[PDB]
């Protein structure tokens, strides 16, 4: 019956956990594995309204907040876009974190492009569509 829809989302979460783990253990992305700490960056909350990082993405997977890879990528994109919005481009550290943000985005999209079945993704998007009704 409609068990098939839950099976789709279970398989989607298992896939997302795997992709996210590969990102989180990549040394390039260490800086994105924990939330930005206001004690170390006191002006961060004055720039960035919707913080995101890989530990929060893992929590969101487990609490069923991603029904599609589209929505998952929205949060990977948000990690990157927060980093490019917040961080200036004035010293070598700034350039490094900005290049890392783009690489996080590019790496996640490339894994998805390579490993995600398009008909599987499309089914997840269309179930989400039917549940909007």
């Amino acid at each position: 019956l409609e068990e098939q829809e839950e099976d789709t989302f279970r398989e989607l979460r298992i896939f997302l956990r795997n992709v996210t783990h590969r990102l989180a253990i990549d040394k390039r992305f260490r800086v994105f594995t924990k939330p930005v700490d206001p004690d170390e960056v006191p002006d961060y909350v004055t720039v960035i309204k919707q913080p995101m990082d890989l530990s929060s993405v893992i929590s969101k997977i487990d609490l069923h907040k991603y029904l599609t890879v589209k929505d998952y990528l929205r949060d990977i994109d948000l990690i990157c876009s927060n980093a490019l919005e917040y961080n200036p481009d004035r010293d070598p550290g700034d350039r490094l974190i900005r290049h890392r943000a783009c690489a996080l985005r590019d790496t996640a999209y490339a894994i998805i492009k390579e490993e995600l079945d398009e008909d599987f993704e499309q089914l997840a998007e269309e179930i989400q569509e039917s549940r909007k009704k």
Partner: peptide, 7 residues
């Protein structure tokens, strides 16, 4: 931008 990290 904000002021950046490491400061």
């Amino acid at each position: 931008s904000g002021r950046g990290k490491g400061g």
